[PDB]
Amino acid sequence: SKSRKIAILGYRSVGKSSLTIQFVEGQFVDSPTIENTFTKLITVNGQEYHLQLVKTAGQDEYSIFPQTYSIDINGYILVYSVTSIKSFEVIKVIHGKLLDMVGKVQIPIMLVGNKKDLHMERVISYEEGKALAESWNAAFLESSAKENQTAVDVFRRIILEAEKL
Ligand SMILES: Nc1nc2c(ncn2[C@@H]2O[C@H](COP(=O)(O)OP(=O)(O)O)[C@@H](O)[C@H]2O)c(=O)[nH]1
């Protein structure tokens, strides 16, 4: 089995913890906001993976980008909320500072718009975030931390993008 380490980046309250618990624990529960690493076995294309999932502390436009992430990470999930215009604007900034940090080592990157279950609360269309991912040449998905199958699909997509390198 292979070992891979995945950093989950994003603004606060966009659902980094909830997506990662929905994937690791199989369930949607609460009870962090402080960085935490989760382990998880998964098979992608018949290949077994040991995953260290780093759910980061949550970054704003000003919070410095930590180098530690760059040093050992194999893929980055950038999550925003489809109910928060601020988190979408923040993920653009996060992306530039992460490219500023690894330089241009063509590292697996993926954009996720979370909370797609909140139909009445949506302010960002699917197409708006899909255009953003394509201008980055990154994979795009909309997820809901209430729906296990969209959580699982985010995490096996970032490993798919990692095998391609
Ligand atoms: N309805 C809905 N609520 C969510 C979703 N993801 C997170 N939440 C809620 O939004 C808040 C987000 O908190 P959290 O998951 O810790 O986000 P984090 O700060 O980025 O780690 C919590 O109250 C969650 O219950 C989702 O997909 N759908």
Numbering used by the authors: 4 to 34, 37 to 170
Give sentences copied directly from the paper behind this entry.
On the other hand, the D60K mutant was shown to be unable to bind to Mg2+ or the nucleotide (either GTP or GDP) and hence to assume a nucleotide-free form; thus, it is regarded as a dominantly inactive mutant and widely used as a negative control in the functional study of mTORC1 activation (Tabancay et al., 2003). In contrast, the dominantly inactive D60K mutant cannot activate mTORC1 in the presence of either GppNHp or GDP. To investigate the molecular basis for the incapability of the D60K mutant to activate mTORC1, we determined the crystal structure of D60KGDP at 2.6 Å resolution. Surprisingly, there is a GDP bound at the active site of the D60K mutant with clearly defined electron density, even though no GDP was added in the protein purification and crystallization processes, which is in disagreement with the previous functional data showing that the D60K mutant assumes a nucleotide-free form. Nevertheless, consistent with the previous functional data, there is no Mg2+ bound at the active site (Tabancay et al., 2003). Intriguingly, attempts to co-crystallize the D60K mutant with GppNHp failed to yield any crystals. In the D60KGDP structure, the long, positively charged side chain of Lys60 is extended into the Mg2+-binding site, which not only hinders the Mg2+ binding owing to electrostatic repulsion but also expels the side chain of Thr38 away from the active site, to adopt a conformation similar to that seen in WTGDP but different from that seen in Y35NGDP. In addition, distinct from all known WT and mutant Rheb structures, in the D60KGDP structure, a portion of switch I (residues 35 and 36) is disordered.
